[PDB]
Design an enzyme around this catalytic site. Structure first.
Site, mmCIF file in Angstrom:
data_model
loop_
_atom_site.group_PDB
_atom_site.id
_atom_site.type_symbol
_atom_site.label_atom_id
_atom_site.label_comp_id
_atom_site.label_asym_id
_atom_site.label_seq_id
_atom_site.Cartn_x
_atom_site.Cartn_y
_atom_site.Cartn_z
ATOM 1 N N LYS A 73 -32.218 21.664 -31.629
ATOM 2 C CA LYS A 73 -32.087 22.429 -32.860
ATOM 3 C C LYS A 73 -30.998 23.471 -32.688
ATOM 4 C CE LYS A 73 -35.569 25.791 -31.628
ATOM 5 N NZ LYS A 73 -36.974 26.286 -31.777
ATOM 6 N N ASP A 114 -42.470 24.491 -31.341
ATOM 7 C CA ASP A 114 -41.632 23.602 -32.163
ATOM 8 C C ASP A 114 -42.412 22.701 -33.111
ATOM 9 O OD1 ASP A 114 -39.194 24.713 -31.370
ATOM 10 O OD2 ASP A 114 -38.560 22.948 -30.204
HETATM 11 N N1 LIG Z 1 -46.314 30.190 -20.374
HETATM 12 C C1 LIG Z 1 -46.561 28.811 -20.496
HETATM 13 N N2 LIG Z 1 -46.980 28.197 -19.390
HETATM 14 C C2 LIG Z 1 -47.249 26.846 -19.398
HETATM 15 N N3 LIG Z 1 -47.167 26.095 -20.547
HETATM 16 C C3 LIG Z 1 -46.816 26.824 -21.603
HETATM 17 C C4 LIG Z 1 -46.482 28.139 -21.669
HETATM 18 N N4 LIG Z 1 -46.149 28.471 -22.930
HETATM 19 C C5 LIG Z 1 -46.199 27.366 -23.637
HETATM 20 N N5 LIG Z 1 -46.660 26.351 -22.878
HETATM 21 C C6 LIG Z 1 -46.878 24.970 -23.318
HETATM 22 O O1 LIG Z 1 -45.707 24.191 -23.236
HETATM 23 C C7 LIG Z 1 -45.752 23.184 -24.250
HETATM 24 C C8 LIG Z 1 -44.500 23.258 -25.108
HETATM 25 O O2 LIG Z 1 -44.564 24.407 -25.945
HETATM 26 P P1 LIG Z 1 -43.340 25.438 -26.022
HETATM 27 O O3 LIG Z 1 -43.132 26.030 -24.691
HETATM 28 O O4 LIG Z 1 -43.674 26.274 -27.183
HETATM 29 O O5 LIG Z 1 -42.101 24.460 -26.269
HETATM 30 P P2 LIG Z 1 -41.545 23.729 -27.610
HETATM 31 O O6 LIG Z 1 -40.721 22.615 -27.063
HETATM 32 O O7 LIG Z 1 -42.655 23.460 -28.544
HETATM 33 O O8 LIG Z 1 -40.643 24.844 -28.254
HETATM 34 C C9 LIG Z 1 -39.342 25.118 -27.748
HETATM 35 C C10 LIG Z 1 -38.821 26.389 -28.345
HETATM 36 N N6 LIG Z 1 -39.569 27.597 -27.809
HETATM 37 C C11 LIG Z 1 -38.656 28.333 -26.926
HETATM 38 C C12 LIG Z 1 -37.474 27.408 -26.716
HETATM 39 O O9 LIG Z 1 -36.316 28.080 -26.275
HETATM 40 C C13 LIG Z 1 -37.375 26.713 -28.033
HETATM 41 O O10 LIG Z 1 -36.769 27.554 -29.020
HETATM 42 C C14 LIG Z 1 -47.070 23.368 -24.850
HETATM 43 O O11 LIG Z 1 -48.034 22.482 -24.591
HETATM 44 C C15 LIG Z 1 -47.383 24.773 -24.748
HETATM 45 O O12 LIG Z 1 -48.731 25.073 -24.885
#
Ligand SMILES: Nc1ncnc2c1ncn2[C@@H]1O[C@H](COP(=O)(O)OP(=O)(O)OC[C@H]2NC[C@H](O)[C@@H]2O)[C@@H](O)[C@H]1O
Ligand SMILES: [Cl-]
Ligand SMILES: [Cl-]
EC number: 3.5.1.-
Length: 141
Positions: A73, A114
């Site tokens: 994105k 996301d």
């Molecule tokens: N601190 C932490 N630890 C372990 N796993 C986590 C954590 N935070 C989120 N997650 C998990 O990682 C998975 C992916 O979520 P996310 O980290 O929100 O990634 P996305 O791919 O959905 O979003 C990406 C976007 N957020 C920040 C990036 O720079 C993008 O803009 C999901 O299952 C979350 O519950």
């Protein structure tokens, strides 16, 4: 199974695995697992310099393996399309094949902030990586 699931810390996967997660073109990495990739690996300048766009992949080579930044994105606040996730995954696959990567670890990419659905993303991963020997391990806390 293309995908093996592990409960625990993505960052305690084998040191020989390559890693993947999703970010924007802005490389802000301020939330989610991304902020942990930022803390652990840095490389923001190097990533920005690659000038990768939605549907592409930026890559850091560290300790003989790769950290893949799926550029899904434009802005951090946007939400990705499945099409751009798929294109980024295909870009990662191509790099993996060319560079001999056989073992990838990742979170439930796209399915936190996301807002994509893992029932779809899992199937997408299986379709994209079919007919490769690239083993994928997906971590959740
Ligand atoms: N601190 C932490 N630890 C372990 N796993 C986590 C954590 N935070 C989120 N997650 C998990 O990682 C998975 C992916 O979520 P996310 O980290 O929100 O990634 P996305 O791919 O959905 O979003 C990406 C976007 N957020 C920040 C990036 O720079 C993008 O803009 C999901 O299952 C979350 O519950
Ligand atoms: Cl970002
Ligand atoms: Cl750097």
């Amino acid at each position: 199974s293309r995908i093996t699931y592990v409960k625990g810390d993505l960052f305690a996967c084998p040191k020989t695995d390559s890693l993947a997660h999703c970010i924007s073109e802005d490389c802000r990495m301020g939330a989610g697992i991304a902020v942990l990739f930022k803390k652990k690996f840095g490389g923001v300048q190097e990533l920005l310099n690659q000038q990768k766009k939605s549907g592409e992949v930026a890559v850091l080579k560290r300790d003989g393996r790769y950290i893949y930044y799926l550029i899904t994105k434009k802005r951090a606040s946007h939400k990705p399309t499945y099409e751009n996730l798929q294109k980024s995954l295909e870009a990662m696959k191509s790099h993996c094949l060319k560079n001999g990567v056989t073992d990838l670890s990742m979170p439930r990419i796209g399915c936190g902030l996301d807002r994509l659905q893992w029932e779809n993303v899992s199937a997408m991963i299986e379709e994209v990586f079919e007919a490769t020997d690239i083993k994928i391990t997906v971590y959740t806390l």
